[PDB]
Each structure stands twice: as C-alpha cells, then as structure tokens.
C-alpha cells in the first residue's frame, strides 16, 4: 500500500474576502469665507496631522498584524512541536 501512506490532499480550500474596504472621500468646501475671502488666518492649518494619522494607521496595521504574526508563529512553533514529536515518533516507529 505505497500510496495511501502519504495522504496527498490540498487543505488549501479556504477563501478570505478583502471586501469591506470603503475609503471615505473627504469633500471639504475648499473655498475660504464667502467669495475670495474676508478672513484668512482662521482656516485650520492642521490636515497634514490627518495624513500623518493616515501613516499612524499604516504603522498601526504593520504593528497590529504582527502583534498577530508573532502570534500565529508562536501557535506555529507549538504546532511544530507536534511535527517534532511526529518526526521523532516516526524515527521511533521505524526503529
């Protein structure tokens, strides 16, 4: 029975959706007070803060997924402990 003793099957049958990524287009008025303006100083010089918070949420997802990739690979080394005993137990069960 030289074939069934290596159970050759694709467990790769999962399909994760990337749906739900709805980028909200900001649509500020982009015109100063009334016609060409009667004020200028008070227009909130800031928004490179909101784009530096867009790079905070880049570096937060580089963090968060890798706070979840130490994770999956701590789980993997605990599965690979099962592979190390399955291999040492396979040398044992050949011996």
């Amino acid at each position: 029975l030289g074939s069934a003793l290596r159970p050759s099957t694709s467990r790769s049958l999962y399909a994760s959706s990337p749906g739900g990524v709805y980028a909200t287009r900001s649509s500020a008025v982009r015109l100063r007070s009334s016609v060409p303006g009667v004020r200028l100083l008070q227009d909130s010089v800031d928004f490179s803060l909101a784009d530096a918070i867009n790079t905070e949420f880049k570096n937060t997802r580089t963090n968060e997924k890798v706070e979840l990739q130490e994770l999956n690979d701590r789980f993997a080394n605990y599965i690979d402990k099962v592979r190390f005993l399955e291999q040492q137990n396979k040398i044992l069960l050949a011996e």
Binding site: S8, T9, R11, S12, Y14, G19
Partner: protein
C-alpha cells in the same frame, strides 16, 4: 439660467454602485473535491 449638474446620478448616488451594493459576496470557500484511494 439652468444648473449644469454633472451629478452623482439618482440611480447610484444613494445605491453604492460598482460598489458594495453590487455586492461582491465572494466568500472564497475552495471546493475541495476530496480524492480517496478507494474503488467500491
């Protein structure tokens, strides 16, 4: 005078078109056709 409104047209403005209302419902379950080593 008549306002030349190049609108978000009243058939997709409130209706999320191409689009999540066109609903890419593609949960990617792989159709694992399990191959067994057995003739009946």
């Amino acid at each position: 005078m008549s306002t030349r409104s190049v609108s978000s047209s009243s058939y997709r403005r409130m209706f999320g078109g191409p689009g999540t209302a066109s609903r890419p419902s593609s949960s990617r379950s792989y159709v694992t056709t399990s191959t067994r080593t057995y003739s009946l």
